[PDB]
Symmetry: C4
């Protein structure tokens, strides 16, 4: 009963249930050649959603993504490109959601991407220093300038998203259409309980990230930090600490149990976890991450697992995770 393509929240934008992100990898961990191969595989398998941010690899991720698009020559109308704005430089005024940085930041991102506009521009996080009205007006401005088709939020509380909505309706500006939130077996509350309320009330869609908890859900950290794994990269000590933390080891324990279910279904753990993220219609799309083609092809294979996620399998997983949120 899976619909590979679905509307992003209550908007007319149709996105593939799986998208491909560029955090850590593009312009950073992987070569541009590998990046080109991964994007081609995604596109060829129906994926039309690609996410990035001005902050990724100090702008390099956008340059690489833009180069691939130009090199491959795919029709712009067949792509859904999203980018996030917030961290755009070391200067005081090069960060935040002020009208100045939203305009300067997106303009710079578009230049790096070699694109006239992105399909969705997201505030990468909330800005306690900028009044909602200014941010909503600025987002509306860039959309009206043809620099973006839609705008959205990321890591905003449901109250903040509703505040953006309130401002849009009070001053007749454009309402946000999507919230890019973390979602995986170890982070469920927001996406499973709060976001559905926003969907029904104001049509905001949910585009989720880190479906494997940065690779942790793959289960390859079962016995330490594998050489060259994300957690071993420079600038990712924070990920390593989480993995080696007491709770991180408790997560691995549960993964072992989940691993059993995977085998019982005939799929890998990552495939189980990703398919799990797409089990409810509440999620419009899950953004994937991959450092090589084997991972990406494996991940995309999650779609075949979906039909096997019976209410029985779901309850089993909840029993193991023991973190089913309260409705």
């Amino acid at each position: 009963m899976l619909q590979f393509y679905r509307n992003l929240g209550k908007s007319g934008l149709r996105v593939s249930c799986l998208g491909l992100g560029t955090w850590v990898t593009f312009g950073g961990q992987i070569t541009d050649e590998m990046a080109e191969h991964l994007m081609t595989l995604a596109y060829d398998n129906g994926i039309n959603l690609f996410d990035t941010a001005e902050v990724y690899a100090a702008g390099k991720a956008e340059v690489v993504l833009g180069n691939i698009i130009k090199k491959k020559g795919w029709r712009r109308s067949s792509l859904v490109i999203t980018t996030k704005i917030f961290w755009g430089g070391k200067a005081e005024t090069e960060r935040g959601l002020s009208r100045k940085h939203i305009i300067e930041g997106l303009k710079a991102s578009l230049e790096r991407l070699q694109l006239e506009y992105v399909d969705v521009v997201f505030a990468n996080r909330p800005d306690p220093n900028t009044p909602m009205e200014e941010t909503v007006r600025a987002m509306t401005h860039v959309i009206n300038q043809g620099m973006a088709m839609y705008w959205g939020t990321s890591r905003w509380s449901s109250m903040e998203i509703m505040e953006a909505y309130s401002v849009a309706r009070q001053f007749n500006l454009i309402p946000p259409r999507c919230e890019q939130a973390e979602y995986h077996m170890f982070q469920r509350e927001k996406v499973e309980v709060q976001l559905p309320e926003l969907f029904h009330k104001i049509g905001v869609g949910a585009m989720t990230w880190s479906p494997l908890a940065c690779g942790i859900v793959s289960g390859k950290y079962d016995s330490g930090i594998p050489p060259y794994s994300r957690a071993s990269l420079k600038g990712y000590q924070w990920l390593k600490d989480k993995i080696l933390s007491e709770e991180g080891r408790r997560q691995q324990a549960k993964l072992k149990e989940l691993q059993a279910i995977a085998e019982r279904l005939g799929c890998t753990l990552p495939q189980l976890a990703i398919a799990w993220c797409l089990r409810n219609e509440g999620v419009s799309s899950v953004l994937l991450g991959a450092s090589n083609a084997e991972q990406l092809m494996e991940n995309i294979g999650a779609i075949q697992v979906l039909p096997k996620l019976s209410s029985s399998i779901v309850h089993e997983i909840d029993s193991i995770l023991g973190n089913k949120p309260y409705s």
Copy 2:
């Protein structure tokens, strides 16, 4: 009492009571040379309205229409060019009335047409996947961007048109100005009963299409499918089936009776049918279709039949058709 030129609904746009469409013919069934001749004949006879769509001949119709305009060099201000948006490609995001496709679609159409803007951009059909607000805001955006002067609907129910109006008035956007609907002796309800209500309530005008039911009303299918008739073209099996269907044969029977009236008036059947479509002021313009110059000149001749359409002749036609709608 006929006014060759009239306002399109309650707008300041003046259109000829007859327009020339490009479906099937331009960039497809006929040569560009024939297309040039037909458009010249139309223009020289006072017709200022020419309709097309991004979907016609996969974009070729717009290219041909644009070439003729450029070659003939007619003043842009003396022309009323309309195009329809909805089917713009095979990719998921290349169809519909989302802000993304409305903007990308019209931009591409304008490029093919070699025009800076169209006079009216129509949604080719309703989009159940896009909220009215998004569509109305997008139409408003392209008008404000100078890509179109006005926008309209096509094949929308009167309720959907009123919904577009509701959205425009609630958010202070631009209301639709015209509905391009099917109208001929065998399809009367919507145009004769519903559209007049929209005209009086919200000033929406009626621009009708397929006045000869794709050629069926010409009566040339009286004894089968004539070689090279539209119904015999590739990709038009649907038309042939309708003609050969039980109801299609019942239509021909009535045509024979109508044919009698035509002769009694001194005009052809097509001329009778077209003049019939223009008998009421409710219709702003009737879009013609033609594969050769004889047909077009014949069709334009319908204007001379108008004065002969007495209340008596109209009642006779209703008696024959037996499908006069209930008011």
Copy 3:
């Protein structure tokens, strides 16, 4: 107590109490050389307001006005250029106040003028075929597009001007700022009674035209139609008929009486009539017309007569004219 410069109605635009028009003369009756001399004289004497229209000499007036500006090289910021839109071609859609013609017409005028924008764009007359909302939205659009700084009306009734205002306030569009109306000793009602109401109620200013009734007030038609006078030009039979009409001869009779007052004041009749037009603050500026430098210099001299227009002189003139409107 005369202020040579004043605000145009309740707007921040400062115009000279005298302006120079281009009807009949520019690109038509006079040579471009004479036109250049007249504009230079005006500008050098403090006049910053120059009026034209897309219809004058089929566009030639705008070309000449634009050439002079470019040749003389005056700063654009030191000029107030106004043009009027309505009659822009022979095609059906090349006339009126529809969104299509307002945009196409002003764009064409700007091209002829070699200017990026006019200070004020006026509807040359009312358009019974275009809803007020469409016209007001179109005027607002060109102002927002930077093609004009302000918009106004011409030959509109006070009710129609208030209707434009109603539409602007209901849909949050831009209100009109000036009405260009006929004003001279033989046409007083509208400017003396109605326009002041609009000034106080909605801040609309009054820019008047034909201060000499096309030359009639000069008194040179006292004994027939002087060779080469405007009334003798081709396409101006209408003016000649008015002059030779019964009422036209009755006007000359009164002019003779006025002539006496002029001599008593030490000024010419035209100077008396023009100064008369500027006697009340209700008029922001009077648009002058001239076919040679003697006339223009004479007319500008009207400013010196102003101080001599005592309440006694005004009553005398009213007694002679016998057409003082009722308040």
Copy 4:
């Protein structure tokens, strides 16, 4: 507890607590070489705010400021450039806050600055000849045109600023974000009593000017007009008169007393006065003025004095000045 960077009023724009102005100096009193050195020193010390005006040195100040930016090549996103509009030429229409001059003036300023936009455009003073609605709409227009990020007022009464706010909320336009007001030990009322009310009520910020009262607070006029001091420059007789006026001599007397406190703190008088201006959070930034590098470096040193401004020191200063406003 000082935060070097702070929000400009309730906006997301972050400005350094100290800014560098260009009045008198740039393109005028100092060489472009000196101007370059001063701006570099400011920038290198964290200052991101630079103020100018179309009227300064008849446009030359903007040319010099723009040249330095281009020569130094600093990222535009790391700078906050503000300019003021009002006096833009000798022609009648080249001054004021009409839509015409706001657009023409800022366009010309941007051209001189070699910039696409300024961060904040200020009305240099109030315009009694232009209705608030026109000014607010024009400011909104240039912001929407991408010529400025924000707009503000200068030398406007708190009532006039609230009027601009009223207009913005009534017609859904953009509200002003900052008031550039005079602030120093001899001019305190407005900034200390009125502006805080506007901050809390409508989020307007306070950017202050002439922190040394044009150099008077430096105390170098203790015994006359020093050669080459601002007060001795051509076109600044007004400053000299103030200094030599009875009240001006009374100010010097108090400066002598303040001088004592400075020495007691281990700082210069200018440093004491500038730090004094930044003692309250009500002031977002203080615009500095300097004719040489010694002054600028001295002034910037005011930041170190801040921590020494105890409630005791403040009361002492108030006792000396004797002009503490009433709350």
